[PDB]
Amino acid sequence: KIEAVIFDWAGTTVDYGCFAPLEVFMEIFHKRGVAITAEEARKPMGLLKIDHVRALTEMPRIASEWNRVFRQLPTEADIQEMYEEFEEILFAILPRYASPINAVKEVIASLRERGIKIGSTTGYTREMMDIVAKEAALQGYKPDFLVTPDDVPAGRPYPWMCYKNAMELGVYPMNHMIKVGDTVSDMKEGRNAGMWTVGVILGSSELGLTEEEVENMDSVELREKIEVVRNRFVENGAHFTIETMQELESVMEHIE
Amino acid sequence: KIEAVIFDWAGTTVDYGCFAPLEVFMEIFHKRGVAITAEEARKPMGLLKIDHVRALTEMPRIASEWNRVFRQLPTEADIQEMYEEFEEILFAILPRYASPINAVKEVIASLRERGIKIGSTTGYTREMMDIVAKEAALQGYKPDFLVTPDDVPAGRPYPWMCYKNAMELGVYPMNHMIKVGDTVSDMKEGRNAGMWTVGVILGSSELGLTEEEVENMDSVELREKIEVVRNRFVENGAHFTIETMQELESVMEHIE
Numbered sequence: 001k002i003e004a005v006i007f008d009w010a011g012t013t014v015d016y017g018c019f020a021p022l023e024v025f026m027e028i029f030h031k032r033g034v035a036i037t038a039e040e041a042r043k044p045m046g047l048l049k050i051d052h053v054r055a056l057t058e059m060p061r062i063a064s065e066w067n068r069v070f071r072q073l074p075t076e077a078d079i080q081e082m083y084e085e086f087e088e089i090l091f092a093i094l095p096r097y098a099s100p101i102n103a104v105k106e107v108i109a110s111l112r113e114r115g116i117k118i119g120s121t122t123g124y125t126r127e128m129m130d131i132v133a134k135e136a137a138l139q140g141y142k143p144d145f146l147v148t149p150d151d152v153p154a155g156r157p158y159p160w161m162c163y164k165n166a167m168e169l170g171v172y173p174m175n176h177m178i179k180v181g182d183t184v185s186d187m188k189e190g191r192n193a194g195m196w197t198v199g200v201i202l203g204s205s206e207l208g209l210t211e212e213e214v215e216n217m218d219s220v221e222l223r224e225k226i227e228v229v230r231n232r233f234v235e236n237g238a239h240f241t242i243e244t245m246q247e248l249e250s251v252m253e254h255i256e
Numbered sequence: 257k258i259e260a261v262i263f264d265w266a267g268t269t270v271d272y273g274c275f276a277p278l279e280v281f282m283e284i285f286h287k288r289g290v291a292i293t294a295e296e297a298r299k300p301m302g303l304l305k306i307d308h309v310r311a312l313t314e315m316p317r318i319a320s321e322w323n324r325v326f327r328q329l330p331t332e333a334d335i336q337e338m339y340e341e342f343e344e345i346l347f348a349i350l351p352r353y354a355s356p357i358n359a360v361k362e363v364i365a366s367l368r369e370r371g372i373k374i375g376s377t378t379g380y381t382r383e384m385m386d387i388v389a390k391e392a393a394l395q396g397y398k399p400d401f402l403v404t405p406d407d408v409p410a411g412r413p414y415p416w417m418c419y420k421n422a423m424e425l426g427v428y429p430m431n432h433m434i435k436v437g438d439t440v441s442d443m444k445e446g447r448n449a450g451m452w453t454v455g456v457i458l459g460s461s462e463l464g465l466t467e468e469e470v471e472n473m474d475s476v477e478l479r480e481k482i483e484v485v486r487n488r489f490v491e492n493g494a495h496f497t498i499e500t501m502q503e504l505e506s507v508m509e510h511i512e
């Protein structure tokens with residue numbers, strides 16, 4: 001079994017902690033006087049950027065807090081406007097948060113050795129990826145194929161992007177594919193796609209941590225946190241959790 | 257739970273017995289003083305209309321009468337000339353075979369009442385499906401979505417055409433979908449698609465009869481004749497087999 005692996009981008013292979021979009025989601029909302037936590041603004045991470053914005057205006061607190069200031073819930077105009085602001089800020093600093101996360105490369109290197117194809121589903125737009133891919137390639141990492149919510153009719157909770165990878169790589173049986181990701185969104189996407197869903201933790205968005213505070217964080221603590229991210233993935237569709245790409249192969253191994 | 261049903265065209269919903277092509281081939285060869293029969297025409301089943309002429313070209317008996325005529329043996333030219341003097345003849349007589357099979361119209365309505373999105377895949381090229389379809393619609397039959405080998409890379413044996421219906425009808429698990437067909441290769445497409453596969457028999461193709469050797473074929477013979485088709489099916493990978501489109505809902509029911 002297993003003829004192909006499909007990787008999330010920002011959080012699984014590139015951008016540790018998935019930080020590019022973070023402050024921005026918070027920024028646009030703060031200019032309106034709403035203010036949300038780095039937590040909420042990271043719940044629906046995985047979705048098509050605009051959907052991600054739309055989801056933020058829909059959470060009760062946010063959606064309520066909003067009403068308390070404008071005396072009415074958020075309009076398309078608003079969100080549509082908020083996205084336009086997001087679109088240019090994120091677009092400007094997007095080049096930085098783009099270097100591959102410490103580990104992957106060797107793993108892909110290994111995976112391609114046993115003749116395994118590498119696909120790639122993502123939350124960024126086509127216009128965005130153009131960027132993230134060039135530099136990500138320049139730093140070594142060029143999956144065999146890339147899909148975006150533009151290529152298909154719908155965002156990410158749907159398998160749609162995955163199908164296009166399978167169609168492109170040329171692997172028939174949906175259950176001959178591993179889906180590695182770092183968010184709740186991916187879990188579903190993998191399960192809905194009918195694939196083996198693996199979910200990395202350290203570097204993920206879930207855990208949501210950099211380094212000078214993971215590699216410089218108190219044992220228990222961190223272990224206690226990994227343990228919180230691990231459950232979320234499992235209790236959200238996920239057949240296996242991992243603490244990093246090094247442990248991936250072994251999972252494939254066990255899928256026998 | 258069964259959410260969608262991908263129906264095949266010729267043999268399943270239109271052209272009872274699938275005779276559209278059978279006549280064209282017998283026709284193109286007739287011209288070139290090379291008489292071929294209904295079985296030794298049917299015999300090289302499925303394949304790409306082009307590579308079919310190719311097959312028929314290698315039928316010992318055909319390659320022998322051919323050489324008796326032109327004193328050579330078919331060439332890359334002849335094949336082309338043939339697959340070309342094929343399409344035009346098809347386009348010209350194809351509407352006579354886009355008449356919905358007695359049964360199917362009345363059944364689609366019933367799935368429709370249950371909220372089951374209707375899809376379909378095929379072998380006929382877009383150039384042809386457009387014709388066949390247009391007539392079919394004009395006669396009360398029109399699936400929610402259509403797909404031709406052209407809509408995707410590789411042809412039929414692969415799951416690509418189902419992955420695209422699913423994507424368009426909007427149904428998640430491939431296994432919340434039933435694929436109904438009238439051929440061996442039709443079963444493969446479903447299994448590979450990873451969806452419950454069903455085979456319809458009296459609509460021929462694998463059977464090869466018409467209403468005058470079915471509607472009037474002797475009992476002990478028709479049956480002895482049916483069982484063989486039912487077996488070829490079960491062998492090539494179908495989960496179920498129904499003598500008619502009617503049972504289809506009893507099966508969807510059994511599957512639940």
Ligand SMILES: [Mg+2]
Nearest residue numbers: 010011018205
């Ligand atoms: Mg991520």
Ligand SMILES: [Mg+2]
Nearest residue numbers: 266267438461
């Ligand atoms: Mg057929």
